[PDB]
C-alpha cells in the first residue's frame, strides 16, 4: 500500500538548480524519515541525506553539503530535494527511500539502522551544456536497411517503421552520446521502408523512406 | 566507502558469496548492515537488514553474515532472476548511512554467442553536408562485452570513434554501436574502411568501400 511517487525527468543546464518531489502514501507521513540517494549512470548508490518530517530536521551527506536542501510538507505528504549549482557530474537517477521499520512501534523511524524497504521509481536528471536540437535523418544502405538519426538533444527519440505496420525484424539501437553533447542512434530492419522518427523535445517529426 | 568486488558469478542451483569490506566505524562495530538487490531500471529492494535478518517475502536462499570488518551476502540455489546489482550499506558512527560500490552478479544460463556485425557507409546525403559517418552495428552477443577497433585500409584509426556501452536486448543477448566520423575527403582517399569487433578473444570484421 506504500507508494513513493517521484516527479518527472529533468534536463538542466550547468549552474542551474533542480527541485524534485517525492509524494507519499500508505503510512503516517510524519512517523518515518525520508532519505535521498543518488545513482550516477552505471555507478553505485550514494547517500545524499535525510529529513525528519516531524520536526523538519535534516542531515546531509558531506559530499553534497551546501548544495542540497531537503524539505517536507505535511499538508501534501510530499518531500522535496533541491540540488544547487548543478554540473554534468550530477547527471544521475535520484531516489527517495522510506526507512524500514523493524521495531514494534513504528515511530520516528530514522532509517539509520534497519535499511530502507520502499523506494520511489527514481527521477532521471540530465545535466548538459547542450541545448535542444532536432535530428537529421539519413538512409543506411549497404555498399539490412535502416536510418541514421544524427545529432539530436536531448533524449528520447522514438523510431517506428511504416507507421508501425512494420514490427518484424526491426532493431533500434541505444543512442551514442557524442563528445559534442549530441546523440545519434541507428534503427535497422533485417516493399517500401519508411522511418518515423519522433523527437518531442524539439517538436520534430521526420519520415524517411530508404531504398 | 564500503568495498565490494565489482562482479561475481555463479551457475544455476550453485552458490555465490558477495563480500562487503568496511571499517570498524561501520561494519565492524555495528550490526546494522543492509543488502539491496537492484534489477535494471528498478529501485533497489531491501534483502537483508541487521546483518542476517530478511524482510517479509525474501527467500531463505539469501544468507547474510559478517566477520570483523567484512560483511558477506551468500545466495544459494541461484536462479536467472537473481542476476542484478547487489549493494551493501551500513550505519556509520556519527549519524550517516554509507554504501558499497555494488557487485554485478551474473547467472550463467545463456550460452556464449558471437556478435553479428553490420557496417554501413556514409550516405550520399551526408556527404553533401560535408560530413561522413560510418556506422558499425553489433548485435546478439553474450556475454555483454566487446571491444571495437576501426581501420582505414590496414591502418588503425581511433580519432573520431564513438562507441556505446553494451545494452541488453529483448532476447537477453546484448547490443552495441560504434560510429566513425570522417571528412568526405578521408572517406574517398582510402580503398576501404573496416570495423573489427572482438568478443571473448574472437574477432568479427566488416568492410565498406567508396
Author numbering:
A (entry chain H): 1 to 143, 153 to 199, 208 to 228
B (entry chain L): 3 to 212
Give the original sentences from the paper that presented this experimental model.
IsdB is part of the S. aureus iron-regulated surface determinant (Isd) system, which plays an important role in the acquisition of iron from the human host. IsdB binds hemoglobin and heme using widely conserved NEAr iron transport (NEAT) domains. One class of IGHV1-69-encoded mAbs blocks S. aureus heme acquisition by binding to the heme-binding site of NEAT2, while two additional classes reduce the bacterial burden in vivo by an alternative Fc receptor-mediated mechanism.
Efforts to crystallize NEAT2 in complex with STAU-399 or STAU-229 were unsuccessful. For STAU-229, we found that the NEAT2 peptide MTDLQDTKY (residues 342 to 350) showed reduced deuterium incorporation in the presence of Fab. We projected this epitope onto the surface of NEAT2 and designated this region antigenic site 3. The interaction of STAU-299 with antigenic site 3 shows recognition of Isd-NEAT2 near α-helix 3, using STAU-299 CDR-H3 as the predominant interacting loop. Because STAU-229 is encoded by the IGHV1-69-2*01 allele, this mAb has a different inferred germ line gene sequence than that of STAU-399. The residues in positions 52 to 54, encoding the key amino acid motif PIF that was conserved in all of the IGHV1-69*01-encoded antibodies, are changed to PED. The I53E and F54D alternate residues encoded by the IGHV1-69-2*01 gene make this germ line-encoded CDR-H2 loop more polar and hydrophilic than that encoded by IGHV1-69*01. Similar to the studies that we describe here, repertoire studies with human antibody responses to the influenza virus hemagglutinin stem region show both canonical CDR-H2-mediated IGHV1-69*01 allele (F54 residue)-encoded interactions and noncanonical IGHV1-69*09 allele (non-F54)-encoded interactions mediated by CDR-H3 (38). It was interesting that the STAU-229 mAb described here is encoded by IGHV1-69-2*01, which lacks the F residue needed for heme-binding-site recognition, and indeed, this mAb recognizes an alternate antigenic site. Conversely, when STAU-229 and STAU-399 were incubated with IsdB and associated with hemoglobin, we did not detect a difference in the binding signal compared to those for IsdB and hemoglobin binding alone. STAU-229 significantly reduced the burden in the kidneys.
